[PDB]
């Protein structure tokens, strides 16, 4: 009896992959400072983002199979090079460095004298600078060289731009949609009872860090434990905190900028003398707040590893500096902190057997992150003392392979892949394409 | 916006217009004022394939017996071999996601009946009926 009929706009979608753009909230543009991070032409966010709750719907999510992460990872990388392209290349800095020990803490800073090319191509320039031990390597008085010269090339980041992370909403073009998991407790895998859709994801600050998730989103109720493959010790374990942990990272060296002239037209910013406290960079963590968090987290691991077992913490095993330390950016400078003091503990079933804690931090201006070869970025010196306060919202953890599986387990801070950092914010999101076209049988026919 | 995807097909016909609107349109008019070689292609590649995917749907709507959006009907008889069912078992008791699942085998077959059996044979039929 019936007849086929074309319906346009039926609620049907399929899992797929597309190219997502950014959103800057249209305030970051007023923040100016000559293109801070991403935002230059970045899309103004809709003042009223739309979230539609889909009733009677259950969708299965996988955060580890999420494609939004891979795009974001490649975005930050592609974003990084484009910031370094118009800037000043430091290529003729590979000149021999004659260094000496600074006037305590085993001479971490080196005072280096070297020959340099002026605006004119005739006479050289005899000038001195100040580099950290991590930025230089001796070659055989004491003679040193740039640490990156044998490995790769080098370019200086522009002082105009800042590395300051600003909220970025990922949105989908016409024909696509983004699903949001509204459950309080979600490990990133399995069906989601309450699912809502949004045009743009929430505010996500692209904070690049290791061993500590900084400035992220807090969990709901109980703290969350996420891992791709849990029983497998080769896979990292992502943790999401409930209450934010106050962390202080400062540069207890009050510095000055030389702004030497290596023309024509180009000017390099050298590190002058340090006027102030003679100290190494340090990181503060409140003993009470970290412990309270640890006690709640250590109970969550026993929802898997069993109600009763011994869980011991220890600092990094070994590897590259990026893996073994906490790496991040504060005030333009790149800190590498020693987390060994926090991870020194041993816990009982429900308990573990002062007013402050500190963590020695090292500074490195010349960096190759993401295992990049051919391009090394020089972090320009900053006038005055840098102070910053951030939230610790999660960790990257690894489990030992030595077993003795039925006895006890030890966990250590992870590192390496930065995709895990983005999976922390993207676990509740995935991309699907909408299929509007549909057919249904009805009596209407036609004349 | 997709709210009835979990609901029955009968209830899903009421909010049909909302899906048509948002899916169909881009009206942000945001960005593209100041040029970039790098990222800009990325915000291009997405919306260019979007309008290509868009005109793709519009073609089927035109070449078939629709010539208009939302709902339109046709002279194609519903085959018994295609989801033999009860009328109340489809709209009232069944959902679109559940529905498209079964028709998956006959979907390409039905498409042929719309463009070939109708607008090729109907418009020619119309030309013969409009002469007299």
């Amino acid at each position, epitope marked *: 009896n019936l007849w086929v009929t074309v319906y346009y706009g039926v609620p049907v979608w399929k899992d797929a992959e597309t190219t997502l753009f950014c959103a800057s909230d249209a305030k970051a543009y007023e923040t100016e400072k000559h293109n801070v991070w991403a935002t230059h032409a970045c899309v103004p966010t809709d003042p009223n983002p739309q979230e539609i709750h889909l009733e009677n719907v259950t969708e299965e999510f996988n955060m580890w199979k999420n494609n939004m992460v891979e795009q974001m990872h490649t975005d930050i990388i592609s974003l990084w090079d484009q910031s370094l392209k118009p800037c000043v290349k430091l290529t003729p800095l590979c000149v021999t460095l004659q260094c000496t020990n600074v006037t305590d803490m085993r001479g971490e800073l080196k005072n280096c004298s070297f020959n340099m090319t002026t605006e004119l191509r005739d006479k050289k320039q005899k000038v001195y600078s100040l580099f950290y031990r991590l930025d230089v390597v001796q070659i055989n008085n004491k003679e040193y060289r740039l640490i990156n010269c044998n490995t790769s090339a080098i370019t200086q980041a522009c002082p105009k731009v800042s590395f300051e992370p600003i909220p970025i909403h990922y949105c989908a073009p016409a024909g696509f949609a983004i699903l949001k998991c509204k459950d309080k407790k979600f490990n990133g895998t*399995g069906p989601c009872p309450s699912v809502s859709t949004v045009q743009c994801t929430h505010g996500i600050k692209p904070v690049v860090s290791t061993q500590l998730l900084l400035n992220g989103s807090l969990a709901e109720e109980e703290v969350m434990i996420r891992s791709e493959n849990i029983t497998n010790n080769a896979k990292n374990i992502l943790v999401q905190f409930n209450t934010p942990v106050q962390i202080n990272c400062t540069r207890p060296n009050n510095n000055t900028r030389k702004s030497i002239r290596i023309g024509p037209g180009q000017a390099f910013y050298a590190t002058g003398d340090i006027i102030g406290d003679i100290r190494q960079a340090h990181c503060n963590v409140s003993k009470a707040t970290w412990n309270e968090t640890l006690g709640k987290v250590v109970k969550q691991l026993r929802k898997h590893f069993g109600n009763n077992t011994i869980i011991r913490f220890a600092n990094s095993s070994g590897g590259d500096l990026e893996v073994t330390t906490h790496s991040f950016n504060c005030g333009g400078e790149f800190f590498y902190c020693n987390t060994s003091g926090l991870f020194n503990s041993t816990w009982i079933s429900n308990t573990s057997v002062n007013d402050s804690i500190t963590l020695p931090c090292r500074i490195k201006q010349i960096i190759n992150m993401w295992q990049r070869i051919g391009q090394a970025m020089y972090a320009p010196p900053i006038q005055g003392v840098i102070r910053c306060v951030s939230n610790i919202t999660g960790l990257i953890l690894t489990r030992d392979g030595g077993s003795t599986n039925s006895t006890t387990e030890t966990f250590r801070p992870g590192g390496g892949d930065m995709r895990d950092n983005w999976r922390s914010e993207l676990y509740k999101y995935k991309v699907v394409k909408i299929e509007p076209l549909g057919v249904a049988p009805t009596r209407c026919k036609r004349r | 916006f997709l709210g009835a995807a979990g609901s029955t097909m009968g209830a899903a016909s009421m909010t049909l217009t909302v899906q048509a609107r948002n899916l169909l349109s881009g009206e942000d008019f945001t960005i593209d004022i100041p040029d970039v070689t790098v990222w800009g292609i990325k915000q291009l590649q997405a919306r260019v394939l979007a309008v290509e995917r868009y005109l793709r749907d519009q073609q089927l709507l035109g070449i078939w017996g629709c010539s208009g959006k939302l709902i339109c009907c046709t002279n194609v008889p519903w085959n018994s071999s295609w989801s033999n069912r009860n009328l109340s078992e489809i709209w009232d008791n069944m959902t679109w996601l559940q529905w498209d699942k079964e028709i998956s085998n006959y979907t390409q077959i039905i498409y042929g009946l719309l463009e070939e059996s109708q607008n090729q044979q109907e418009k020619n039929e119309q030309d013969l009926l409009a002469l007299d």
Partner: antibody
Amino acid sequence: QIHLVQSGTEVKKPGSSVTVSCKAYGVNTFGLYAVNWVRQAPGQSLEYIGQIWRWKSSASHHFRGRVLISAVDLTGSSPPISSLEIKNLTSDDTAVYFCTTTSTYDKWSGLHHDGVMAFSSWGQGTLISVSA
Amino acid sequence: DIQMTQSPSTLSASIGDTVRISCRASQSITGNWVAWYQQRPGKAPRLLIYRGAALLGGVPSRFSGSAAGTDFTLTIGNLQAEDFGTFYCQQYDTYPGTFGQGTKVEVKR
């Protein structure tokens, strides 16, 4: 890859209660994978008993309430494990029991049909002989 | 509750032959929700084809399914030694799933 390892051979007497366990190796979670319990009578065909899907236990109208299917997800010391219990054992229950699973992540896959599905991965099987 | 009928219960076929095993459901199954399994003696049954024609990855191209209305049939061309065993047809169309009588493919000589 995917490996389903069940318990050993159980010989149990009538009236008693039997519990078999299925260790699912290679499975990331039971959220993306539905577990179905199917038995096979000797010299006879296969019969569907029950299932657990989206952490919801279910069984055929034959075994309603008489069959109990429980499962726990991936832990830190072992893969995801499911267990099947049958109380009030009789002589007709002597069939060979199989632990099966299927990937439910693909929403438009032909493997599943709203709770009722095919079985991609099969276990080693467990024979239950009921005799006094 | 669907009842699946297979024919024949057992058959004799040689190597290289084209084997066709049919199946019929108590009612008409549309959307083609039907599965075919292979079981070698002493071994667990393996899934071959789902949705009646859709072959699983890792299965040779020699196997071909067909699904129309109440009548279903599985076609196996160029029969080989490893193919011999007991085959079952199953419908997941409605709750609960029910299998067929089974078909024993037996070596010819």
